[PDB]
Amino acid sequence: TMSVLGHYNNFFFAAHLLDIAMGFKTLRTILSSVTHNGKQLVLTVGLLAVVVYLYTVVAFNFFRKFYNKSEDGDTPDMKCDDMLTCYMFHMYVGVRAGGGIGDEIEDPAGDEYEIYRIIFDITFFFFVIVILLAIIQGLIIDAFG
Amino acid sequence: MESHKHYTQSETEFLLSCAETDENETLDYEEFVKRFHEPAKDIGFNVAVLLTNLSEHMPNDTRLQTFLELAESVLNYFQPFLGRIEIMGSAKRIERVYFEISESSRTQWEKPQVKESKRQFIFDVVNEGGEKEKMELFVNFCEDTIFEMQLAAQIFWKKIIAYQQKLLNYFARNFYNMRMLALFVAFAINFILLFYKVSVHYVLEESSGYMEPTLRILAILHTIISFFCIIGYYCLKVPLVIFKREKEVARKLEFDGLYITEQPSEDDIKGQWDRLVINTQSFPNNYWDKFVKRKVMDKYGEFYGRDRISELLGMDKAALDFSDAREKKKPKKDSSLSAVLNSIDVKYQMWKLGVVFTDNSFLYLAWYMTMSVLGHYNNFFFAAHLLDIAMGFKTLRTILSSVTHNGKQLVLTVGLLAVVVYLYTVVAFNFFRKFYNKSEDGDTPDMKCDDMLTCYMFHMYVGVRAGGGIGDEIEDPAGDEYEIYRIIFDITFFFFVIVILLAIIQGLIIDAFGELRDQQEQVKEDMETKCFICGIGNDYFDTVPHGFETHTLQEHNLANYLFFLMYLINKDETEHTGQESYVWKMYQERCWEFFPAGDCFRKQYE
Amino acid sequence: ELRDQQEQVKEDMETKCFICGIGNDYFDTVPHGFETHTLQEHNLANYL
Numbered sequence: 001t002m003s004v005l006g007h008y009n010n011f012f013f014a015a016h017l018l019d020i021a022m023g024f025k026t027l028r029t030i031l032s033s034v035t036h037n038g039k040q041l042v043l044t045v046g047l048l049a050v051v052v053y054l055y056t057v058v059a060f061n062f063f064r065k066f067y068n069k070s071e072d073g074d075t076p077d078m079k080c081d082d083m084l085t086c087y088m089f090h091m092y093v094g095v096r097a098g099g100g101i102g103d104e105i106e107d108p109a110g111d112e113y114e115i116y117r118i119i120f121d122i123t124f125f126f127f128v129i130v131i132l133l134a135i136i137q138g139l140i141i142d143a144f145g
Numbered sequence: 146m147e148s149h150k151h152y153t154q155s156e157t158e159f160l161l162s163c164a165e166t167d168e169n170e171t172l173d174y175e176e177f178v179k180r181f182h183e184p185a186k187d188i189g190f191n192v193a194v195l196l197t198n199l200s201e202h203m204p205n206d207t208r209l210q211t212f213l214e215l216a217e218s219v220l221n222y223f224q225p226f227l228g229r230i231e232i233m234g235s236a237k238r239i240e241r242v243y244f245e246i247s248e249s250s251r252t253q254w255e256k257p258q259v260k261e262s263k264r265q266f267i268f269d270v271v272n273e274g275g276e277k278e279k280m281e282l283f284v285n286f287c288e289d290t291i292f293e294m295q296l297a298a299q300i301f302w303k304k305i306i307a308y309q310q311k312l313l314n315y316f317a318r319n320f321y322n323m324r325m326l327a328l329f330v331a332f333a334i335n336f337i338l339l340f341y342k343v344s345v346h347y348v349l350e351e352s353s354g355y356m357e358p359t360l361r362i363l364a365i366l367h368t369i370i371s372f373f374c375i376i377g378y379y380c381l382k383v384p385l386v387i388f389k390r391e392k393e394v395a396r397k398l399e400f401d402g403l404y405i406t407e408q409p410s411e412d413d414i415k416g417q418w419d420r421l422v423i424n425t426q427s428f429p430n431n432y433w434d435k436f437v438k439r440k441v442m443d444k445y446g447e448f449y450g451r452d453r454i455s456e457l458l459g460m461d462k463a464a465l466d467f468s469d470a471r472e473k474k475k476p477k478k479d480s481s482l483s484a485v486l487n488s489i490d491v492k493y494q495m496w497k498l499g500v501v502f503t504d505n506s507f508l509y510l511a512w513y514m515t516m517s518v519l520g521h522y523n524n525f526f527f528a529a530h531l532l533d534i535a536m537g538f539k540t541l542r543t544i545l546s547s548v549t550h551n552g553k554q555l556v557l558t559v560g561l562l563a564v565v566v567y568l569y570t571v572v573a574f575n576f577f578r579k580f581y582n583k584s585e586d587g588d589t590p591d592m593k594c595d596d597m598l599t600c601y602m603f604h605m606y607v608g609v610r611a612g613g614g615i616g617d618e619i620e621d622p623a624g625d626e627y628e629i630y631r632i633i634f635d636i637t638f639f640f641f642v643i644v645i646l647l648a649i650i651q652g653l654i655i656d657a658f659g660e661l662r663d664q665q666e667q668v669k670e671d672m673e674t675k676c677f678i679c680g681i682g683n684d685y686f687d688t689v690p691h692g693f694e695t696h697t698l699q700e701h702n703l704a705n706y707l708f709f710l711m712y713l714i715n716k717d718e719t720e721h722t723g724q725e726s727y728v729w730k731m732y733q734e735r736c737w738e739f740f741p742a743g744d745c746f747r748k749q750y751e
Numbered sequence: 752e753l754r755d756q757q758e759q760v761k762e763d764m765e766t767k768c769f770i771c772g773i774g775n776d777y778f779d780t781v782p783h784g785f786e787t788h789t790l791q792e793h794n795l796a797n798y799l
């Protein structure tokens with residue numbers, strides 16, 4: 001079927017490069033590993049989404065004035081003036097930022113919510129970055145092993 | 146009856162000879178089986194256990210082989226009714242005792258909560274408990290489980306009480322379904338909350354009607370469901386925990402004399418809360434042993450003062466109540482006419498409240514209800530109910546237990562991290578304070594190092610999460626006045642704080658998760674490839690086909706042992722056999738040498 | 752490795768005798784057998 005579709009759009013022949021993953025032994029092992037801990041991986045990703053949603057609701061409630069992803073504007077591109085937009089922004093940026101979420105939004109630098117915002121950023125970087133993402137990576141690598 | 150392939154013509158005519166012919170050619174099969182089946186069933190069970198004993202003792206006899214083919218033809222009916230136990234006592238040899246298992250007992254064992262109690266006991270007895278107290282914990286589990294089975298089987302004044310009892314029973318029976326419904330409605334209301342927006346002025350803007358009132362509907366429904374959940378729990382699982390605690394304190398009073406000769410410490414709040422009602426009126430309300438008071442009185446009365454014992458144990462000035470009840474006792478007594486309420490004991494009620502408010506699960510349900518109530522004020526508090534999946538699933542519970550497991554080590558490692566960050570903070574505040582200018586145009590310099598606490602917070606907040614030390618976010622030296630020292634500072638920070646201590650914390654948590662998972666799968670492997678009672682092994686029974694599975698399902702079944710204990714309890718003693726009376730005496734004296742420790746019937750005989 | 756050595760030392764002190772080192776299963780026949788064996792018969796404090 002992929003060959004027939006490649007006859008229509010020639011770029012569909014790239015899906016045939018995954019044939020080595022089935023022809024070799026260690027690549028089959030990698031695929032079987034990413035499939036092995038299926039339920040555990042799905043549940044860990046669910047817990048990740050749940051904790052990111054909790055951080056999302058607390059940021060949408062309290063720290064909604066820090067999510068101004070603009071440099072000159074002057075129209076503010078507020079990523080927190082919408083619950084779904086803020087949740088997608090969190091799940092898409094704060095998980096892959098490698099340093100939590102406080103490293104891509106503006107710093108507090110003001111003694112009105114500074115300590116709470118610092119606690120927020122540190123707890124995000126701890127639970128979401130160096131625990132849950134590490135737990136998913138460990139699940140997959142331990143399945144491979 | 147002649148065409149159902151289970152009767153011959155002689156048997157059909159013999160059974161038709163038992164007809165009634167009630168002047169209309171009609172027999173009542175209901176009364177027929179109600180009259181002609183029960184004693185037949187009893188005596189057939191007796192002869193069946195006799196034939197089974199003869200079989201399992203003397204094998205390979207052709208006359209006994211014909212007797213055994215007839216026996217098994219009978220046994221195809223009595224298979225789920227007879228249980229066998231392998232006792233070791235009174236003869237220094239393994240003895241296979243046989244007994245009856247009730248269909249009601251089988252149903253209460255198949256009941257859901259009993260299975261959860263069984264799996265929890267297996268887990269916490271293979272993980273924490275070893276082999277010295279393994280049989281003690283197993284007997285305690287058997288007692289708690291037969292109490293739970295009794296409770297599950299149990300699940301103007303004659304118009305409201307009879308309805309509130311049925312309501313409470315319905316809640317206790319549908320407690321788990323109520324939990325699933327609460328989780329579903331929490332997911333629904335949280336999806337609706339995800340569909341939100343803002344204008345200072347919150348508004349569910351991403352929808353066009355049909356979504357604003359359903360939020361309030363689901364909120365009030367979730368609150369009602371949480372209330373029903375806690376109400377069902379308080380009458381489904383609270384009896385079991387209060388029964389366990391009553392049994393513990395009563396046996397501590399009887400055997401060890403915890404509050405007579407060996408008064409507990411000052412830090413054990415459990416001891417004080419039990420001393421609170423060691424002297425209440427209805428002390429053994431669920432332990433089904435309403436004579437522990439008299440037992441401990443007779444045990445510790447002639448040494449520490451019978452009057453003092455009767456005073457500190459409740460039931461004051463009634464040291465002759467036993468004789469008064471033995472000689473011309475009162476027949477009965479009406480409840481009251483002027484006292485319709487307050488008949489219960491406030492001391493025992495306060496004790497029950499104090500023991501249920503520390504159950505660690507009733508506390509979770511109370512937190513659930515409180516979060517629902519707070520969500521009624523601010524709807525965003527319903528997001529805290531999404532953490533219910535973390536307790537409902539197994540691997541998420543494992544993750545939480547992992548982040549809690551290495552508590553002291555994690556706290557001390559975080560403390561060492563804070564200490565080394567404070568050392569770097571003081572050295573930077575002293576020497577390299579001119580590099581912490583977090584400004585691009587200014588011209589007002591935003592010096593993050595002109596204050597010790599500000600510099601420490603800046604370090605702990607930026608240099609730990611920067612992933613490349615601290616030198617990658619402050620200005621580079623580029624000047625041969627402090628360049629080498631600043632480079633050493635940055636490199637040592639990136640080494641000690643980033644690639645050692647943070648890695649050590651992450652490793653602590655991930656290793657706790659791995660250890661918990663490995664303990665779980667080790668418990669599973671031990672339950673699959675090792676016997677619970679004897680623990681001889683798997684290879685010994687891996688000789689005949691399905692050997693170990695039949696050994697664990699027929700000979701050494703934990704359900705069979707529990708049913709045997711229940712049978713001994715409901716056996717109406719003075720009718721016990723030799724083995725049954727021996728096991729009952731051992732159970733009464735709390736010895737438990739009748740369990741096969743390192744031997745079995747197959748290892749004893751051929 | 753350091754943590755594992757520490758917990759191995761602890762496990763050896765808990766499930767093995769210091770003087771003789773016969774084992775734990777041998778004394779795990781009577782109740783509290785190994786504990787009484789290490790607290791009464793082969794006590795290091797007693798030897799000192």
Ligand SMILES: [Ca+2]
Pocket residue numbers: 719720721
């Ligand atoms: Ca008798």
Ligand SMILES: [Zn+2]
Pocket residue numbers: 676677678679680681696701745
């Ligand atoms: Zn066995």
Ligand SMILES: [Zn+2]
Pocket residue numbers: 768769770771772773788793
């Ligand atoms: Zn020794």
